[PDB]
Design a protein around this ligand. Structure first.
Ligand SMILES: CC(=O)N[C@@H]1[C@@H](O)[C@H](O[C@@H]2O[C@H](CO)[C@H](O)[C@H](OS(=O)(=O)O)[C@H]2O)[C@@H](CO)O[C@H]1O
Ligand SMILES: O=C(O)CCCC[C@@H]1SC[C@@H]2NC(=O)N[C@@H]21
Length: 172
């Protein structure tokens, strides 16, 4: 099984640059590394990754994702790398990363994180606690840089935001 327009090699499924509007069916359940980056994804329906329990890397960077559903990563307990950079995300659902105990590389930069809203506090506390794995780049050029997740319209890092500077009434 392999989606047309993706490159399949063993437990790698590389859909990087496929111009997909939607996640394709037919990604093998034994897949270990999944590139869905550089497509036109705008949403993820709940459960889309639930049968992909062997994933160790998931790259969703360079799409138009406006939100993530609660629990979308809950079955991926072997995940080490997660790419969410260069999307349209305004917050992360509460606890979205809790079931990802093996993460070593996370990309969150270049999103319009909405730091006025109380929904940002999960992400803010998470980045503060897991600062040593938040970064940028690739292979030789990987660099830890937790301040690169920035509040939209400011130069304030998401991890500097406190509850007192958020409001439940400023959440679209
Ligand atoms: C199929 C493959 O190996 N693709 C590589 C691709 O993943 C690399 O892009 C980087 O992906 C990471 C995680 O998704 C991150 O988005 C990097 O962006 S960043 O702004 O530097 O943080 C992407 O550059 C590229 C790197 O040139 O290489 C492909 O081979
Ligand atoms: O290619 C580069 O220039 C380094 C990787 C990209 C890092 C991005 S650029 C926007 C955002 N702000 C940062 O300080 N880093 C990320």
């Amino acid at each position: 099984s392999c989606p047309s327009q993706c490159s399949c090699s063993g437990t790698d499924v590389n859909c990087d640059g496929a111009r997909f509007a939607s996640v394709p069916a037919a990604i093998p359940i034994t897949t270990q590394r999944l590139w869905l980056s550089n497509n036109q994804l705008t949403k993820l329906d709940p459960g889309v990754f639930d049968s992909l329990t062997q994933l160790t890397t998931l790259y969703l960077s360079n799409n138009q994702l406006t939100a993530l559903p609660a629990g979308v990563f809950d079955k991926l307990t072997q995940l080490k790398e997660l790419g969410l950079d260069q999307n349209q995300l305004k917050s992360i659902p509460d606890g979205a990363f809790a079931r990802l105990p093996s993460l070593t590389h996370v990309w969150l930069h270049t999103n319009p994180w909405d730091c006025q809203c109380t929904d940002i506090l999960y992400l803010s506390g998470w980045v503060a606690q897991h600062s040593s794995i938040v970064g940028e780049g690739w292979l030789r050029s990987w660099t830890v840089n937790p301040d690169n997740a920035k509040c939209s319209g400011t130069n304030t890092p998401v991890r500097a935001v406190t509850e007192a500077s958020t409001s439940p009434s400023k959440c679209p």
